[model samples]
Target: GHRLVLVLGDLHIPHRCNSLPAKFKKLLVPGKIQHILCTGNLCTKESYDYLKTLAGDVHIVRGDFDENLNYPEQKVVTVGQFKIGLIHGHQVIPWGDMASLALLQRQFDVDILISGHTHKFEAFEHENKFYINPGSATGAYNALETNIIPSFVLMDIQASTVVTYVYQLIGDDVKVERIEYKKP
Candidate 1:
């Protein structure tokens, strides 16, 4: 499949960070991404509109700070051969942990779970499933006060496998790493 899924969130635009990194924005051109999954906190319509320009399909779940009442707290989107779960993670007691996330994963029966809230980039396999947090795309500050590294994830999804690319902005440079996961 020629499908590329872009996963990112925690862009507290105009509230925390001013905007996404120029380098990241430069890479995210229209038609390059087949689908966009946002973990919300996009407090304004402009942010959502910006995402629409990059991809015709956009799925968003509500974050704690999201003012849109229509957005759901949780969602499951199927792309290619995978069922991907989306959540903002504020509902999870210990944000971004495997235990809490696995519960939602099991609930959705998803092959991969994607969430955000801590504003840090992370990806790992748990209980034979995949978990990804693209972190804060804008490197926005949260209540935790820890240093935030602006990052996001893009995945090349095939029939039985997915290769995820983690894009991180370190200093003034953008670094990318590839991670692979296959369905059982």
Candidate 2:
């Protein structure tokens, strides 16, 4: 069976952004996604409740601004043949540096590392491992970010390969890009 995982975070919610982009919310209707991985900073219980309506299994890591302290600082989830590590990027020292992220990936022993905090979307393969940052679902502004774009990622996991669909709200339109990765 194929597993669809939704990756997103950094909502900041009632503090920074009111809600997720309209297009994003429209596309993310319940039933399709099997699991959700959030990089935290949801800021309120309402945000967590919203995620619960989308998927049955939801994993979240604590971000600096998260009001829910019960969320772990780091999490590991297995989907298909992939071991995924989830963490909010605030703990990464330089906040989105590849070297620092790679180190954490090694520590977690995961094939894919997912994180968010910079309010920027990114995905790349390094040292035969995959890394992804789903950005902010609400396009919340970070301290250094000026042009924040609302974005998220949906990964289709099948066996040893995964196809990642990147969803970004650019202007009034939503742009989707596909990136594929296989276990080495």
Candidate 3:
């Protein structure tokens, strides 16, 4: 029902409380977001279900520490004329480096590739593929052992463009910065 999309990741929900950040509650106004993609490590199904409440359609990949082992390692979401690849980023060894990411890009062949695990915000074109890591929504843990904060990303997709909204955890508050993505 939409040509626009929203992507975010690494929301370590319940870390602070049973609710999302006040800023997030204020930020995620439906109709502004179409498709949702999540990078895992939610720690509980309750968190996953909470994420499900945020968007109409949600895509999630299992993280190393998520309570649900049933969640897939990766998923491909098709919106309008686009194919988006979503993964939680734990299976890729030596993660965050370009080579492992590039390998996934080649493997997926979708217009955009989404992942988490680094817990840092990253957006760029590698070997002609678009990649984004929204960091931690609540600025949670590393992919496995590394340390990181709670952050998240937001993207608005149009017929031929994807506008990115990167938000960070500034002492428990979320601050958004804007960026855009054009076709590959």
Highest-TM-score candidate: 2
Query: In model 1, how large is the Cα lDDT of residue 128?
Result: 93
lDDT for every model? 0.88, 0.90, 0.72
Clashes of each: 0, 0, 8
Over 4 Å off, model 2: none
Task: List ranges where model 3 is wrong by over 4 Å.
Answer: 1-4, 15-19, 30-32, 143-149
Worst 10 residues of 3 by lDDT: 141-150
Best-to-worst TM-score order: 2, 1, 3
TM per prediction: 0.97, 0.97, 0.84
Candidate 2 lDDT tens digits, 81-150: 8889999988888989999998998799888998787888999998998999999999998776889888
lDDT tens per residue, model 3, 1-184 = 3354556666656653355566776776755566677777777788666656666787777877777788788898777656788888777788887888888878887888887778777888866678888877665655355556556677666676777777676776566788776776
Which residue pairs clash within candidate 3? 10-137, 136-151, 137-151, 138-150, 139-149, 139-150, 139-151, 140-149
